[PDB]
Amino acid sequence: MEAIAKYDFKATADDELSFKRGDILKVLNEECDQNWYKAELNGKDGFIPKNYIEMKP
Amino acid sequence: VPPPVPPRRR
């Protein structure tokens, strides 16, 4: 599921990861979190807010 | 001015 960061974000949590406005992630599932995805970047998978990205499945 | 991040509980 093609992910696209709409804004500049930095991880808050330890299970979360950073992305800059424009990174293309890889949304490797979602479960219960109806506000957070579990996508991939920079060889690290982590939580990212659904409100900070524009998805395209 | 990016959005207010959701209150998570992961």
Strand segments, DSSP code E, in chain A are: 2-5, 24-27, 36-41, 44-49, 53-56
Burial of A9 (0-12, 13-18, 19+ CB in 10 A): buried
- How far is residue A51's CA from residue A42's CA, in Å, rounded to a whole number? 21
The second-level CATH assignment, the architecture, of A1-57 is Roll (2.30)
Sheet holding A2-5, edge to edge: A44-49, A36-41, A24-27, A2-5, A53-56
- What is the distance between the alpha carbons of residues A10 and A22, in angstroms, rounded to a whole number? 13
CA distance between the termini of chain B:
25
> B1 CB contacts (<8 Å, ≥6 apart)?
none
> Which residues of chain A have a CB within 8 Å of the CB of B1?
none
CA distance A43 to chain B (A): 21
Residue A8 contacts B where some CB pair is shorter than 8 Å: yes
CA contacts within 13 A on the Cβ side of A35:
8
Give the method of determination. NMR
DSSP 8-class letter at B3: P
